[PDB]
Structure 1
Amino acid sequence: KTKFHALMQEQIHNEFTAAQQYVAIAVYFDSEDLPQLAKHFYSQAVEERNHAMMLVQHLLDRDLRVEIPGVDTVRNQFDRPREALALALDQERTVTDQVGRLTAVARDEGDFLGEQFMQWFLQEQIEEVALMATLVRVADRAGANLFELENFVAREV
């Protein structure tokens, strides 16, 4: 019940919430008749759920206490697609900060096991932020013409 252990438990809660927020965004797009975007974020939700369970497994492997948490309410209302994509990007940037902080705390406590465990999550965040940003920029370029945004997703993503 060290600081790294407390933070990993928090990180499990954050990823479960992140995942739920993706489902919400995916369902929004579905509603909006943007099947390509929906398909992507459904898939992204399952990915975040996987990250949550990688964290869970780390605590399991080390006999540290792990609790499956509840999930905070997530945002369902968006004025337009671009606002949902903006939320997603902000979320992955936020998760990136959290992973950085986890790394720093492990270093500080001489938890070399936890420190190396966080390394994979860092490369993943790089690529995930890169994609979420691209989508935001493409959505800006598309403006009201969401057909083009969807075409882009279909071919490039």
Structure 2
Amino acid sequence: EGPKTKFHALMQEQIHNEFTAAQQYVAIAVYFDSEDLPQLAKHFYSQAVEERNHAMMLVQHLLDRDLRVEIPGVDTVRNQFDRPREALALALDQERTVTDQVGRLTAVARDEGDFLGEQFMQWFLQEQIEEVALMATLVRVADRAGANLFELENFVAREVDVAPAASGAPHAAGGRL
């Protein structure tokens, strides 16, 4: 079918990962919406869109370099959470994983001398900094709040804002949402 370099072969895997991550954010947000925490839910509904946009960016990068790309299925994501702290912890966990994955991609790109591939994912590293920062902040605030969830709610409302996205963001397939 044609010789795949492992940057290509692993970036396909990453497309799959970002899609599953988006679905997981939707599930987290839906759990928050059922438990009557609408600011938390709002934030995570925004994050799901952001993650889908990341997936589209990866897809668009494959389309640009004319490598074959599959739009894959998504694995079953988690829906049961006993308290909000666990769902937030899951988000934080996921984002640390995503960071390590993007690290793994940059490394494999640099090994096999794929300079376009090296360069493309600097933006993903940049986004991971701020993203893991925000998640860690939310998890720590959720621990300080404890069972009193309204204070978590107020913290998300006043201090966490999804500001307009800056430039430097690569093109996403079908337009950035």
Give yes or no for TM over 0.5: yes
Distance 2:115 2:83 in 1: 44
d(CA) in 1 for partners of 2:77, 2:38: 21
> Which string of whole-angstrom CA distances, capped at 9 and with x for unpartnered residues, describes residues 14-65 of structure 1?
0000000000000000000000000000000000000000000000000000
* TM-score w.r.t. length of structure 1: 0.99
Q: SS at the partner of 1:64?
A: coil
Which residue in the other structure is 2:77 paired with? 74
RMSD: 1.5
Return the match for 1:147 from 123, 147, 150. Answer: 150
How far 1:70 moved relative to its partner?
A: 0.2
Structure 1 Cα separation of the partners of residues 141 and 94 of structure 2:
18
Deviation at 1:94, TM superposition (A): 0.1
Secondary structure of 1:79's match? coil
For the pair 1:9 / 2:2, whether they are aligned, the reply is no
The offset of 1:67, in angstroms, is 0.5
SS of residue paired to 2:141: helix
Percent of paired sites with the same residue: 99
Q: In the aligned structure 1, how far is the partner of 2:126 from the partner of 2:107?
A: 16
Residues of 2 paired with 1:6 and 1:145: CA distance? 46
Q: Quote how far apart the aligned CAs of 1:147 are.
A: 0.3
Secondary structure of the 2:72 match is: coil
* Poorly superposed stretches of 4+, deviation over 4 Å: none
Once residues 82 and 111 of structure 1 are traced to their aligned partners in structure 2, the CA distance between those partners, rounded to angstroms, is 41
Q: Matched residues in 1 for 2:106 and 2:98: separation?
A: 12
Q: CA deviation at 1:145?
A: 0.4
Measured in 2, the distance between the counterparts of 1:102 and 1:93 equals 14
Partner of 2:111: 108
Q: Equivalent residue of 2:121, what SS?
A: helix
CA distance in 1, matches of 2:48, 2:152: 20
- CA shift for structure 1 position 125: 0.3
What is the rounded CA distance, in whole Å, between the counterparts of 1:95 and 1:65 in structure 2?
23
- Structure 1 regions of 5+ residues with no counterpart? none
Q: How many residues align?
A: 157
- Alpha-carbon distance, 1:148 to partner: 0.3
- Offset of 1:149 from its aligned partner? 0.1
Secondary structure class of the residue paired with 1:66: coil
